[PDB]
Amino acid sequence: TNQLQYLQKVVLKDLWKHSFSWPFQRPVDAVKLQLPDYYTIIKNPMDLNTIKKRLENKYYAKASECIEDFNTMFSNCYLYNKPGDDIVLMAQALEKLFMQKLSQMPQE
Ligand SMILES: COc1cc(C(=O)NC2CCN(C)CC2)ccc1Nc1ncc2c(n1)N(C1CCCC1)CC(F)(F)C(=O)N2C
């Protein structure tokens, strides 16, 4: 849980506080957003709120599962959209800030 503790108390908390994380704090509502074939293209939707709940509920056994959830959220966004898009620019800056806090996680 030590790494998992750091993911929840440091990484998630820091990522959520960035103003441009707002698109990622809730699951993508493909209908209200009028997104065609979102659910056909993205078969594992993921978002920060779900990661929060999973960490609150100790859904994760190992830190690695949680890291994969962060990455899935990013890579879903990179796959469905195009380079240069606003939403991609936001994900890219969020991931850079993710990688930085993750690089200071307790070792081992
Ligand atoms: C909160 O509701 C929204 C409202 C508005 C909204 O109403 N914006 C207007 C209001 C203010 N003006 C100024 C600009 C338009 C825009 C987006 C919203 N939400 C959202 N959340 C997440 C995604 C997303 N959108 N996407 C965006 C990119 C292109 C249009 C959807 C693409 C995506 F594929 F779903 C994706 O990967 N993500 C992560």
From Swiss-Prot:
Disulfide bonds: none
Residue ranges occupied by any Bromo domain in the UniProt entry: 1-105
Tissue expr: Testis-specific. A 3-fold higher expression is seen in adult testis than in embryo testis. Expression seems to be correlated with histone H4 hyperacetylation during the haploid phase of spermatogenesis (spermiogenesis). No expression, or very low expression is seen in patients' testes with abnormal spermatogenesis. Expressed in cancers such as non-small cell lung cancer and squamous cell carcinomas of the head and neck as well as of esophagus, but not in melanoma or in cancers of the colon, breast, kidney and bladder.
Location within or outside the cell: Nucleus
Function, in words: Testis-specific chromatin protein that specifically binds histone H4 acetylated at 'Lys-5' and 'Lys-8' (H4K5ac and H4K8ac, respectively) and plays a key role in spermatogenesis. Required in late pachytene spermatocytes: plays a role in meiotic and post-meiotic cells by binding to acetylated histones at the promoter of specific meiotic and post-meiotic genes, facilitating their activation at the appropriate time. In the post-meiotic phase of spermatogenesis, binds to hyperacetylated histones and participates in their general removal from DNA.
Assembly description: Interacts with mRNA splicing machinery proteins SRSF2, DDX5, HNRNPK and TARDBP. Interacts with the acetylated N-terminus of histone H1, H2, H3 and H4. Interacts with P-TEFb components CDK9 and CCNT1/cyclin-T1. Interacts with SMARCE1. Interacts with the acetylated N-terminus of histone H1.4, H2A, H2B, H3 and H4.
Remarks, miscellaneous: BRDT is a promising target for male contraception. Inhibition by thienodiazepine inhibitor (+)-JQ1 that binds Asn-81, prevents recognition of acetylated histone H4, causing a complete and reversible contraceptive effect in male mice.
Associated disorder: Spermatogenic failure 21: An infertility disorder caused by spermatogenesis defects and characterized by acephalic spermatozoa in the semen of affected individuals. SPGF21 inheritance is autosomal recessive.
Domain notes: Bromo domains mediate interaction with histones that have acetylated lysine residues at specific positions. Bromo domain 1 mediates binding with histone H4 acetylated at 'Lys-5' and 'Lys-8' (H4K5ac and H4K8ac, respectively). The bromo domains also recognize and bind a subset of butyrylated histones: able to bind histone H4 butyrylated at 'Lys-8' (H4K8ac), while it is not able to bind H4 butyrylated at 'Lys-5' (H4K5ac).
Protein name (database record): Bromodomain testis-specific protein
Highest classification ranks of the organism: Eukaryota, Metazoa, Chordata, Craniata, Vertebrata
Residues of the full protein shown: 29 to 136 of 947
